[PDB]
Design a protein around this nucleic acid. Structure first.
Lengths: 218, 220
RNA sequence: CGAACUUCGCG
RNA sequence: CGAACUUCGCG
RNA sequence: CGAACUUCGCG
RNA sequence: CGAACUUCGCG
């Protein structure tokens, strides 16, 4: 089935042993795993992703690129790209089961293997990566995909424990109208927390953050 | 000292689009219009890639537990300033407000490489090779000499030295388990503060004890 | 820069 | 071989 | 990189 | 011979 993956990738390996190592977990072989390949692939793929991000982002400010990048190099996104290659069906593991972390690591090792096998040709590896994922990356960039925020994380928690969503109420507003300060109270059952910020939503996000831990705590 | 041509001579690369180089050397205060922030962002990823590629090829040991600390030092602001000095980068940085520090020099260093990359037509192979011509020797040397970030015991003694002009003391509290799988419990102490550390070796237990003590000294 | 020492990293 | 702390010497 | 003590494991 | 730890030597 190696040739099956090579086809989806659109690239034939000169050293199949290299591809195999990328697809192998530490358990299956304590001497030939993807660890070092994983290490290199992380930085290689990160470069590919950031190269796209800086060219296509609808906002070039650092505060804007950061959250998008965090999502673009996350385990979740890597798994989405991996699925396009049905990568999981090519991975070799001995112990237990395969999870998203393993698929993500392998996705990284896979690209490190292509890079090395091609004679450490970054441009070639990059173009091959883009041919397969540029479109999904650009859409993710345009749609502003980002990691789940607190308020959203919170309601998912409250929803599972008590089958109900939290409430927020404005306690007070300080400062001048052009520089207001908001104090919001997040509430679920009898658990309450305060949040402060430049906007209602920000004050809310912080209140939610504190209320999440106050919950996970007890 | 200031002419871009002088930096291009050090770089070993002449820009087609000079504004790209200028932007890379410009801080936000000097030109709110267009500064190096974006180039910096791209440069971070580019340089990280160049360094890690060397690391995985030349590190004595290929295990992640070994590579991670070398990488941490090799992509640190401190190392970037070391590389930057070979180009006397500080002399070409354009800033209007504030002083030129290591954070700015490090950021400019990243931006500079993003600029070369862009000017060459986003040629990753060419930019990498140009980066190696200047810094490969220094990077492999850092890798060979095992340069890493200061460890906890070392960080602790400096803190205790500065604060009380004395050094920490450690004592082996207990040792147990199979002789081929021992567990050590060590105590670290400075003044009235003491902590316990546990590990697979004496040094490791001590490191954990030093790490916890540092936190205690941070609280008070 | 040089010397002693303390702690640490790599081989 | 390499890094830093302290100290003395020296500039 | 190297030597030895203790222990475990493979032949 | 391989592995873990302890002490030590050289760079």
């Amino acid at each position: 089935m190696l040739e099956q993956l090579e086809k989806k990738l659109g690239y034939t390996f000169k050293d199949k042993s290299l591809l195999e190592k990328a697809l192998t977990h530490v358990s299956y072989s304590k001497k030939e795993h993807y660890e070092t390949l994983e290490f290199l692939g992380d930085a290689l793929v990160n470069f590919f992703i950031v190269d796209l991000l800086v060219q296509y982002s609808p906002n070039k400010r650092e505060g804007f690129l950061s959250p998008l990048k965090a999502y673009l190099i996350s385990e979740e996104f890597f798994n989405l790209l991996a699925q396009k290659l049905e990568l999981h069906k090519f991975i070799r593991i001995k112990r237990g089961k395969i999870n998203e972390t393993i698929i993500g690591d392998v996705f990284q090792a896979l690209w490190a293997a292509v890079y090395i096998d091609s004679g450490r040709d970054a441009n070639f590896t990059r173009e091959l990566f883009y041919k397969l994922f540029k479109e999904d990356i650009l859409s993710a960039i345009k749609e502003g995909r980002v990691k789940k925020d607190y308020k959203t994380i919170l309601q998912e928690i409250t929803q599972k424990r008590w089958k109900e969503r939290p409430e927020y109420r404005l306690i007070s507003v300080e400062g001048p109208h052009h520089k207001k300060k908001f104090i919001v109270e997040a509430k679920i059952k009898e658990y309450r927390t305060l949040g402060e910020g430049k906007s209602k939503k920000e004050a809310e996000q912080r209140a939610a953050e504190e209320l999440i831990k106050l919950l996970e705590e007890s």
